């Protein structure tokens, strides 16, 4: 468990207060659109299984499928973005605090770097 | 003609002997040349004159792209992706230009052999030496880079060649 037991972590909290400082996902996000597509596919499969006209019947049910999937997808995207931001924050802080472990290296140009040449013949 | 550059594509002056007939018989070649001029050359010349008149009314121009020089892979730092990209693109353009240079020299060689005809072995030695030198330099530059050639591989080959030349010079001086 990498990020479990991280200091200051409130248990059973889907989204903490420190995640409110990040940009929320746009409602037209491609991932949100894919969640809506999954909901629509679920509605079509429901119609097919219950032997109703696949594209015609149950418009209210299909709308509920799409809306529920988009709702949960929006919240899931927020949590995913927050966790990745947390990982980047921790990695940067550790690199900053351990310079002897992450030292800057002098950059040698390719004129000074010697590389062996292997002909193709 | 002004279509191409005479200095880039040289042609020796053309020496055509004057006709010196010794018989009273008519020349079928002369008669057929007159017929060809009367029936073909005049109509095609008139057609080209009309076409060129139509072209001169819509005269527009196009230009030759110029690329400014950029630092090469020697100047680029290690794993500096942007400088590496610029240098690699420049090296590829230089490779294309060198290929076209070799093509021009080869065209010189072929045209000279055909023009000289039966005395090509002696009269085309000047163009053979230029082709030999250009091909030697081009081969040393881009001989065995491979299918996935790159500026880094060409630089590594040049470093190997320079090290070999330095070692040979040191051994000779020893
Ligand atoms: C039906 C559904 C669509 C209805 C019409 C659109 C309604 C919504 C309109 C809207 O809001 O538009 C604004 C929005 C514009 O977004 P934006 O804000 O301008 O983008 C900028 C982003 O910030 C940044 O954008 P980005 O370019 O960086 O995108 C990041 C991308 C980077 O992702 C990648 O690099 C990898 C992507 C593939 C990953 C998986 C590969 C392996 C799996 C293959 C598929 C398996 C299942 C089958 O990652 C993702 O998008 C994550 C999800 C990956 C899939 C995205 C699919 C989007 C369309 C959803 C419906 C697809 C239906 C397909 C079948 C259709 C049958 C009729 O438009 C869309 O999102 C429309 C997308 C196209 C819809 C038509 C269907 C195309 C299907 C293409 C399939 C191949 C690709
Ligand atoms: C549409 C492209 C989809 C691409 C993939 C995306 C994922 C799948 C789509 C979501 C699920 C769709 C529904 C599934 C069940 C369909 C059942 C059916 O009959 O459907 C016929 C149904 C119409 O027929 P119906 O009169 O309602 O009822 C006829 C009876 O069902 C007739 O009943 P029956 O008793 O005659 O049925 C017998 C038939 C029953 O056969 C089926 O039911 C086959 C279809 C279901 C199989 C599983 C589907 C996939 C589920 C997810 C799995 C992963 C998908 C990706 C896989 C990738 C690798 C392959 O069984 C056989 O033929 C057995 C032999 C073949 C077996 C071996 C082949 C199996 C292939 C399985 C994979 C198929 C994947 C592609 C999807 C194909 C269907 C759309 O047509 C559709 O549902 C068409 C699709 C929906 C179109 C919506 C259009 C909306 C308006 C335009 C929108 C424009 C774009 C939006 C933006 C705005 C632009 C302006
Ligand atoms: C003022 C009061 C306001 C209160 C507001 C509510 C605060 C949050 C309340 C949460 C609900 C009450 C508790 C009910 C159970 C909570 C479950 C959830 O909220 O907890 C989170 C859990 O969230 C879930 O784990 C994330 C669900 C993700 C669902 C998708 C999984 C990803 C699959 C990848 C493909 C996705 C495909 C598309 C999916 C639809 C974090 O809990 P955590 O203490 O830390 O877990 C400890 C165990 N660990 C450490 C091992 C993890
Ligand atoms: C009817 C049958 C059931 C299918 C219903 C499909 C539509 C469901 C959504 C209805 C509209 C909801 C809405 O208001 O969406 C707006 C929102 C974007 O709005 P917003 O981001 O605020 O503005 C743009 C900012 N630049 O938009 C979003 O957030 C988009 C999220 C949903 C993405 C859905 C992707 C397509 C799903 C398949 C649709 C197929 C429809 C076929 C209908 C056939 C009818 C016979």
Say if CB B77 and CB A108 are below 8 A apart: yes
Per-position DSSP letters for A45-103, written without gaps between them: HHHHHHTS-TTTS-HHHHHHHHHHHHHHHHHHHHHHHHHHHHHHHHHHHHHHH-TTTS-
Q: How far is CA B26 from CA A40, B19, B130, in A?
A: 94, 13, 47
- Does A30 fall in a domain? yes
Which chain B residues have a beta carbon less than 8 Å from that of A105?
A: none
Which range marks the domain in which residue A21 is found?
1-98
Query: Residue A110: which residues within 8 A CB-CB, separation 6 or more?
Result: B73, B74, B76, B77, B78, B152, B155
> Which technique was the structure solved with, according to the deposited record?
cryo-EM
Residue B172 — left, alpha, or beta (φ > 0 → left; ψ -120 to 50 → alpha)? Answer: alpha
Say if CB B77 and CB A109 are below 8 A apart: yes
- Does A41 fall in a domain? yes
Interface test with B, best of A106, A117, A121 (most B CBs within 10 A): A117
Name the helix (H) or strand (E) containing B155. Answer: helix B151-173
Minimal C-alpha gap between A83 and chain B (Å): 30
Can you read off the two tokens belonging to residue A26?
Answer: 């746009």
Asked if the C-beta of B144 comes within 8 angstroms of chain A's C-beta atoms, the answer is yes
Q: Report how many domains make up chain A.
A: 1
Can you read off the two tokens belonging to residue A116?
Answer: 């062996």
Asked if the C-beta of A105 comes within 8 angstroms of chain B's C-beta atoms, the answer is no
- Does A28 fall in a domain? yes
Minimal C-alpha gap between A114 and chain B (Å): 7
Portion 77-106 of B in contact with A at CB < 8 A: 77-78, 80
Q: What is the DSSP-derived secondary structure letter of residue B139?
A: H
Phi and psi (nearest 5°) for B154?
-65, -40
Give the long-range contacts of residues A62-69, CB within 8 A, separation 24 or more: A65/A39, A65/A40, A66/A36, A66/A39, A66/A40, A67/A39, A68/A39, A69/A35, A69/A36, A69/A38, A69/A39, A69/A42
Q: Give burial (CB, 10 Å; 0-12/13-18/19+) of A39.
A: buried
């Amino acid at each position: 468990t990498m990020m479990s037991g991280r200091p200051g972590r409130v248990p059973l909290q889907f989204l903490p207060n420190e995640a409110r400082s990040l940009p929320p996902p746009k409602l037209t996000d491609p991932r949100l659109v894919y969640m809506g597509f999954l909901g629509y596919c679920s509605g079509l499969i429901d119609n097919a299984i219950r032997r109703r006209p696949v594209v015609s019947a149950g418009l209210h049910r299909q709308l509920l499928y799409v809306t529920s999937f988009v709702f949960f997808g929006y919240y899931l995207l927020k949590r995913q973005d927050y966790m990745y931001a947390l990982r980047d924050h921790d990695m940067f802080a550790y690199v900053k605090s351990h310079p002897e472990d992450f030292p800057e290296k002098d950059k040698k140009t390719y004129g000074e770097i010697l590389e062996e040449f292997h002909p193709v013949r | 003609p002004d279509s191409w550059d005479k200095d880039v594509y040289p042609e020796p002056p053309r020496r055509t002997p004057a006709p010196a007939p010794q018989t009273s018989l008519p020349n079928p070649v002369t008669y057929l040349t007159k017929i060809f001029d009367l029936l073909v050359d005049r109509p095609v010349t008139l057609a080209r004159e009309f076409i060129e008149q139509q072209h001169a009314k819509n005269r527009y121009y196009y230009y030759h792209r110029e690329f400014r020089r950029v630092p090469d892979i020697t100047e680029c730092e290690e794993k500096d992706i942007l400088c590496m990209f610029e240098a690699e693109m420049q090296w590829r353009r230089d490779y294309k230009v060198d290929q076209e240079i070799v093509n021009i020299i080869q065209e010189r060689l072929k045209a000279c052999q055909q023009r000289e005809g039966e005395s090509y072995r002696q009269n085309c030695a000047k163009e053979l030496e230029q082709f030999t030198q250009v091909s030697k330099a081009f081969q040393d530059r881009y001989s065995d880079l491979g299918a996935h050639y790159s500026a880094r591989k060409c630089l590594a080959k040049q470093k190997q060649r320079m090290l070999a030349e330095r070692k040979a010079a040191k051994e000779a001086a020893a």
